[PDB]
Amino acid sequence: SPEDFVYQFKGMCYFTNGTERVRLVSRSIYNREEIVRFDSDVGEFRAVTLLGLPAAEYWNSQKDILERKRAAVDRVCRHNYQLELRTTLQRRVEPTVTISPSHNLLVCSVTDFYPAQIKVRWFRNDQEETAGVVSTPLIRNGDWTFQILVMLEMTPQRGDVYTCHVEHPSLQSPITVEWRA
Amino acid sequence: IVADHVASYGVNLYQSYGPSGQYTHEFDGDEQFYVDLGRKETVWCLPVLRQFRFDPQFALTNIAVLKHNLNSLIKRSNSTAATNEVPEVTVFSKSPVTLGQPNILICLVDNIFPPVVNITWLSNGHSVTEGVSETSFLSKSDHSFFKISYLTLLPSAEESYDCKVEHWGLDKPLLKHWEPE
Amino acid sequence: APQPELPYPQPG
């Protein structure tokens, strides 16, 4: 259980409604506690903890530091966003939809997709099943692909068709995989 | 706090243990790249981002600042060491299992603090050094981390797998079993 | 090229 001391610095950018809202929050964290931070909306260093008070007052009295941090929302956030737009934002990975019975349970495996935005529905015949469904959270594989499993409690009978309707930004038309008894 | 997209340009981490450090850029919770501070080179995760160049001198000098900041914060806090958190381990597959075909086994090690972990894979009690890859320490809002290990394999009915995770927040080495069923 | 945010040195 050796001793260990940790220091973290997170230059964080928050974007909303595209390029409309841009906010930079540069956090200076000692162990798991953020001591001091710079927010674009406030325009200066402000201590979260007493441990950040000597850093804030010091850095705020330095004209060269403040200039650099105040222009960082455009130089780092607004700038890097332009590079994301043709790269990360433009990344589209179409999901693979598989239905596996578990039969009283039915699981819709929606795997390997990007971005994280998704909507998946269970249908009995033409009716949409909402009461008997429980969807797992959005699983992050970590290799720029997500996956989700949507389980449905069902009472099967002859002629019944169970449809899994999936909607993703990478698709202009939904993927509807069907399961028959 | 609330935005459409969140990015870290970047995740600067330095701990007294090694002494070790880490530089990464994250976009919407996924690692864009890491800088191998030893090899002095930027290793991009997504093949699209390899059209960009990140100077390793940026990361190297940023880490030289955290080295300074860490020692200063050790003095100010009066050697306030990090408390070892209890990690959360989950083992799942990237896609549904069908034995003949090729799949990837994923080991999520969430709630890591301090970021010192040993993730290893085992097949019927025997260690496997082949086809094992691991992501960098990925940042969390509560200023903790999470790491993901992978094991590329060909599922077999008799072959079972276990994820050997080692962290100071554990009394004994954690082993999460995986049954192909 | 992605632009990085810069941590400043702690006093002193």
């Epitope: 130089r75 780092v76 607004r78 | 100077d55 000098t61 600042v65 | 810069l6 040195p9």
Partner: T-cell receptor
Framework: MKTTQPPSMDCAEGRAANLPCNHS???????VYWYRQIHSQGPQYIIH???NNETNEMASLIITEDRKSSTLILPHATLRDTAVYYC??????????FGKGTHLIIQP | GVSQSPSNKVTEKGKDVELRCDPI?????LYWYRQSLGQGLEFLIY????????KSGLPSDRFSAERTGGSVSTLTIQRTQQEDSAVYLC???????????FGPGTRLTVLE
């Protein structure tokens, strides 16, 4: 991104000296830095800007809307303003580089 | 401002020389430059703290730089050559990549 500027300039004292600089290959995050070296001495920082037309006690800097060209304005040129003026672009980790600059001679 | 010593240095070839640079207080980044009318302003080595990350930019195995304290820096030119004759300039900024402020230089002349 590199800069080009007239090698020599002769201006009358008492009148405002406007020094041009061309930097077409500049990127959004890059700053325009102006240094001067009076002859036998180390360089001296004047001003720097990103987008806005900056002004300080020494001189003023005006960057065009397309950012491809900038100008340094010395409000009332004197014999003390006779030096070589460097226009440089910053920057990432790459580091400072001085060109031939503008050898400005203030005539009385 | 940034201090530099000595102001001038007249030496014979094959001798070793030390160039001191006292930066502005609170500035953790130091830069070393070489200025000759023939060769322009040449970037030699920089420091972020007490360690230099990139040892390139230095002309030969005779050019070394140390900044043990994490403030004042020393540039050492060993077994000097005529080609080394130049005005050695030093700059400092609070942090690496920050605005740089230059010292008065060191005029070095090496003779046969």
């Amino acid at each position: 991104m590199k800069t080009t500027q007239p090698p020599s300039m002769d201006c009358a004292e008492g009148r405002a000296a406007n020094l041009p600089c061309n930097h077409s290959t500049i990127s959004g995050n890059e700053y325009v830095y102006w240094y001067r070296q009076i002859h036998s001495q180390g360089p001296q920082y004047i001003i720097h800007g990103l987008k806005n037309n900056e002004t300080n006690e020494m001189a003023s800097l005006i960057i065009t809307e397309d950012r491809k060209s900038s100008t340094l304005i010395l409000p009332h040129a004197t014999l003390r303003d006779t030096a070589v003026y460097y226009c440089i672009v910053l920057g990432g980790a790459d580091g400072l580089t001085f060109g031939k600059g503008t050898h400005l001679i203030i005539q009385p | 401002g940034v201090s530099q010593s000595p102001s001038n240095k007249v030496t014979e070839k094959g001798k070793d020389v030390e160039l001191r640079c006292d930066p502005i207080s609170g500035h953790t980044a130091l830069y070393w430059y070489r200025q000759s009318l023939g060769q322009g302003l040449e970037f030699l080595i920089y420091f972020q703290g007490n360690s230099a990350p990139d040892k390139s930019g230095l002309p030969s195995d005779r050019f070394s730089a140390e900044r043990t304290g994490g403030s004042v820096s020393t540039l050492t030119i060993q077994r000097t050559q005529q080609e080394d004759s130049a005005v050695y300039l030093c700059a400092s900024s609070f942090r690496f990549t920050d605005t740089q402020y230059f010292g008065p230089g060191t005029r070095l002349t090496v003779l046969e």
